[model samples]
Target chain A: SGSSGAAFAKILDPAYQVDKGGRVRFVVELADPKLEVKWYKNGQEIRPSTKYIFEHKGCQRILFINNCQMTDDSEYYVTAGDEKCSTELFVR
Target chain B: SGSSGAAFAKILDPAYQVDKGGRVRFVVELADPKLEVKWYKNGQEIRPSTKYIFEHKGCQRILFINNCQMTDDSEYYVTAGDEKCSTELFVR
Candidate 1:
């Protein structure tokens, strides 16, 4: 197998929600040939130690949070091999 | 007048539409007391020559943009400044 980003469907850019005690979630899916999955909050990197549910399912999963504070609006990204995208968040 | 942002209703934080040419607008009003208005693109400091409408009607006025490019996604702020608030825009 080749490590490639373009193989992923659409593109996932992380969005953040700010507000202490507020919450948000991210949904992701794979298209065509389904592959293993991993997610990251910020650019913090996801490895075997991460709190994600590793998978090869085709579509949609939710990452949940509650009471997520303002500072949680930081840069977040996802990488499927070399393919990746990221986004920022601000709440007031 | 108060020289107060608190007098302004809702506050206008510039949001941009990026591509080659896209348009966006801002709608603002005055709450407690009526006040004059000004607008900005980016943080470049707008003064007398801008095209903003002036009034004290206690409600909506529109700021229009057409053919706005991605670089137009710059910080925009308005103050009515005894108080202040600002927000950002991101387009992907």
Candidate 2:
């Protein structure tokens, strides 16, 4: 359990890289269980789409971007248990 | 303080409508103090930019988009603590 009954988060990879039209993924670990998991990019909440995939199991959360576009190049954030961690993703 | 010692989020404007190449704004309120506020657009973490303005005071957060384009049409999410809230923006 966590102090103050609150949750936090951390990222194993702070910066990730992928190629244009490629698939990219990274992971985040949350400190609290049953906390809501949310993902964002460039200030947008990311949802699974034909091109983007968001997944979580346990405290580990993952994001997958498909057909990565240069427009997809940006910072990514994951929030769980009231804690957030971010990583930059570069598509070149 | 929140029940879990974590901040939760609520959107005063859940769905907003803006014109193309115009300006858009929406508000959100958080439950806890000294809590980090995060914003996202279309799955991207949004930051104040040449076209975006993010402002906060106390538990309230606001997002402003200038020159809103159809390309800007998407969903926005705000997260505080382990809670999140979202609204869709329509650019017509």
Candidate 3:
């Protein structure tokens, strides 16, 4: 017998559509807890600020984008350990 | 004229080759100081550990891999705010 090889309990969908000036949240769950995670937008690293928030509780990691605009349409990626996932954001 | 648009003062070469069991260091210089930076290997976030070290002094950020092995060969990326750079490592 072998241990489960999965690292992500919940992965993101392919795309997210949001109305302009709306808030958007991307959430994922890890099979394990206490792993360092990073979020990126269009390949650039994102940090905690007024417009972006990062939260982790239990085995879940969350990214919150506030007041999304047309310019926010882009790809988003999250990496945890050897596991990674990506999704696109469309603001209308 | 407007301020300089560049964020990187010195970027990594396309690839680095090192012998097995050797130490390898990747260094980059930012145009400005005191920016938050992140490092990744094969798209996975890397953290400071006994085998991996992260250092920052002045405008430079460095990652040191204490021991090289064939399994260590992979693409490495560094991101600082809106700026990002990548290079490959080949352990022979």
Candidate 1: interface RMSD in Å? 14.1
DockQ scores of the candidates:
0.03, 0.02, 0.02
Task: Give me the displacement of residue B2 in model 3, in angstroms.
Answer: 12
Q: Give the range where candidate 1 chain A is weakest over 10 consecutive residues by summed lDDT.
A: A1-10
TM-score of each candidate structure, all chains considered together = 0.37, 0.46, 0.49
lDDT tens digits, residue span B1-92, model 1: 11122355555542333444555566666575545555565556554323333334456545555455555545455554343323233323
Question: If ranked by lDDT, best first, what sequence of candidates would result?
Answer: 3, 2, 1
TM-score of chain A of 1: 0.59
Stretches of candidate 2 off by over 4 Å are A1-92, B1-6
- What is candidate 3's lDDT per residue for B1-92, written digit by digit as tens? 00123466777654677788998999999978988789998889999997799999999999998788878888788887665667667777
lDDT of 2 by residue, A1-92 (tens): 12233344555353567877899977776665556787888678988788878777888777888998878877677766534556567677
lDDT of residue B29 for candidate 3: 93
lDDT of each: 0.47, 0.69, 0.78
Give the per-residue lDDT of model 1 (tens digit) for A1-92: 11222344544432344566665555555554445555666657645423333434456434544455555545455554444444444444
Docking class of 2: incorrect
Q: How do all the candidates rank in terms of DockQ, highest first?
A: 1, 3, 2
Candidate 2: deviation at residue B17, Å?
0.2
